[PDB]
Write a protein that binds this ligand. Structure first.
Ligand SMILES: *[C@@H]1O[C@H](CO)[C@@H](O[C@@H]2O[C@H](CO)[C@@H](O[C@@H]3O[C@H](CO[C@H]4O[C@H](CO[C@H]5O[C@H](CO)[C@@H](O)[C@H](O)[C@@H]5O)[C@@H](O)[C@H](O[C@H]5O[C@H](CO)[C@@H](O)[C@H](O)[C@@H]5O)[C@@H]4O)[C@@H](O)[C@H](O[C@H]4O[C@H](CO)[C@@H](O)[C@H](O)[C@@H]4O[C@H]4O[C@H](CO)[C@@H](O)[C@H](O)[C@@H]4O[C@H]4O[C@H](CO)[C@@H](O)[C@H](O)[C@@H]4O)[C@@H]3O)[C@H](O)[C@H]2NC(C)=O)[C@H](O)[C@H]1NC(C)=O
Ligand SMILES: *[C@@H]1O[C@H](CO)[C@@H](O[C@@H]2O[C@H](CO)[C@@H](O[C@@H]3O[C@H](CO[C@H]4O[C@H](CO[C@H]5O[C@H](CO)[C@@H](O)[C@H](O)[C@@H]5O)[C@@H](O)[C@H](O[C@H]5O[C@H](CO)[C@@H](O)[C@H](O)[C@@H]5O[C@H]5O[C@H](CO)[C@@H](O)[C@H](O)[C@@H]5O)[C@@H]4O)[C@@H](O)[C@H](O)[C@@H]3O)[C@H](O)[C@H]2NC(C)=O)[C@H](O)[C@H]1NC(C)=O
Ligand SMILES: *[C@@H]1O[C@H](CO)[C@@H](O[C@@H]2O[C@H](CO)[C@@H](O[C@@H]3O[C@H](CO[C@H]4O[C@H](CO)[C@@H](O)[C@H](O)[C@@H]4O)[C@@H](O)[C@H](O)[C@@H]3O)[C@H](O)[C@H]2NC(C)=O)[C@H](O)[C@H]1NC(C)=O
Ligand SMILES: CC(C)CCC[C@@H](C)[C@H]1CC[C@H]2[C@@H]3CC=C4C[C@@H](O)CC[C@]4(C)[C@H]3CC[C@]12C
Ligand SMILES: [Zn+2]
Ligand SMILES: [Zn+2]
Ligand SMILES: [Zn+2]
Ligand SMILES: [Zn+2]
Length: 222
């Protein structure tokens, strides 16, 4: 059914860190989602996951995904198109049934439980999707303190590659990624066993997820 790059967690790498995911082979098929995990996955990732029965994530992985998304949510919550694109990226990265085809584990280490945990991985990204994703978040204004939201979730990223690099770089102490995540844009077309991440993307002037003119340039009148 589903092909995963990782499933579950195999312990922590430090006494104060958090547990890290277990690399699984390509022939591994995850079990059916529990009722508890399925209901929680819908609350965190939206109604798109109601009919999903096989996912590449456990309940603990969804809870870790929820805790980290809720820390960055208030920074981009004013722009629904960015929030929708933002959550959609990390939800497929964690739970999509085709995770094993766009996530390539490249480096592992041993945990305190003496098991292999992810240390560094590659995510094959579709340039057009990452470009439109950055275009929907680059102009969000943090209210009151008159700043840019991209200065926090992106560290002041000037293009989409610097945006995903800020999101993927290992920042465990700063509430970021517990391990190194590299976004690759040069996946060869000859590689048929791999594929690039590509989903529906929403611009900040989209009708269903329109953002204010203060946060979206294309939503402003002329
Ligand atoms: C979004 O915006 C960002 C920001 O602008 C863009 O990111 C930049 O993208 C460009 C273009 O892709 C990259 O340029 C290449 O740089 C490498 C070396 O990178 C070093 O220098 C960068 C400059 O540093 C400045 O800032 C840093 C802080 O970042 C600061 O510390 C420093 O003081 C300075 O002020 C560094 O940023 C870079 O950091 C590394 O680590 C980063 C963190 O992980 C990483 O993100 C970076 O990507 C980088 O890896 C690093 O210190 C150059 O080698 C390369 O030039 C080669 O390629 C071109 C094109 O073919 C060619 O013209 C050159 O000749 C050169 O090719 C020679 O060198 C190759 C490497 O040795 C070798 O393989 C070749 O064979 C060739 O060697 C032959 O010729 C030479 C003579 O040229 C000869 O001596 C040899 O013997 C041999 O015969 C590029 O210039 C930037 O690195 C990158 N920066 C960052 C921060 O990402 C991004 O592209 C934008 N994206 C979009 C979608 O728009
Ligand atoms: C998804 O992620 C995967 C990683 O999890 C990616 O897999 C990696 O893919 C790359 C290419 O895309 C592979 O690189 C090739 O590796 C070949 C094997 O290298 C071995 O032999 C080299 C030459 O030796 C020849 O002769 C001897 C004796 O007859 C034979 O036994 C050999 O088979 C070969 O015919 C040798 O140079 C190499 O040693 C190190 O140096 C190379 C080049 O710099 C590096 O590839 C690497 O650093 C090698 O280190 C390896 O061994 C050391 C200890 O020796 C360990 O750290 C570790 O085990 C490391 O693997 C090595 O002995 C080579 O012939 C080719 O020229 C390419 O270099 C990677 O091997 C492969 N990693 C794997 C399978 O684990 C995958 O690409 C990625 N997918 C996508 C789509 O991105
Ligand atoms: C990265 O993301 C890109 C953006 O989503 C992907 O680009 C898409 O790629 C698909 C497949 O190649 C394209 O769909 C094709 O469109 C052409 C266009 O033909 C037009 O004219 C014919 C003739 O009448 C008509 O029948 C078509 O409907 C079109 O009107 C078609 O010929 C194909 O049959 C097919 O429908 C998308 O158009 C394209 N979207 C873009 C560029 O925005 C890209 O594939 C992704 N790459 C990777 C590696 O994942
Ligand atoms: C720099 C700060 C703002 C980070 C912004 C992006 C946040 C929301 C992203 C970046 C990398 C992401 C993590 C990458 C990998 C995993 C492992 C998985 O098993 C559970 C989700 C979890 C733990 C993700 C949670 C969300 C996360 C932390
Ligand atoms: Zn149905
Ligand atoms: Zn989706
Ligand atoms: Zn591409
Ligand atoms: Zn690296």
């Amino acid at each position: 059914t589903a092909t995963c790059a990782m499933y579950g967690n195999c312990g922590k790498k430090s006494v104060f860190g958090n547990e890290l995911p277990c690399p699984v082979p390509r022939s591994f098929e995850p079990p059916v989602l529990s009722d508890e995990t399925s209901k929680l996955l819908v609350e965190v990732c939206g109604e798109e996951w109601k009919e999903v029965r096989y996912a590449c994530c456990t309940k603990d992985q969804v809870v870790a995904l929820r805790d980290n998304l809720q820390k960055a949510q208030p920074l981009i919550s004013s722009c629904p198109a960015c929030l929708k694109n933002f959550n959609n990226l990390f939800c497929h990265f964690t739970c999509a049934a085709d995770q094993g085809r766009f996530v390539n584990i490249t480096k592992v280490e041993k945990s305190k439980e003496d098991k292999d945990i992810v240390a560094e991985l590659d995510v094959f990204m579709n340039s057009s999707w990452a470009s439109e994703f950055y275009d929907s978040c680059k102009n969000i204004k943090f209210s009151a303190t008159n700043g840019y939201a991209m200065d926090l979730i992106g560290g002041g990223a000037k293009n989409y590659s610097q945006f995903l690099k800020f999101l993927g770089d290992a920042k465990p102490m700063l509430g970021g990624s517990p391990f190194q995540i590299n976004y690759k844009y040069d996946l060869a077309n000859e590689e048929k066993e791999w594929q690039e991440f590509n989903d529906e993307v929403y611009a900040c002037d989209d009708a269903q997820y329109k953002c204010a003119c203060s946060d979206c340039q294309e939503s402003c009148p002329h």
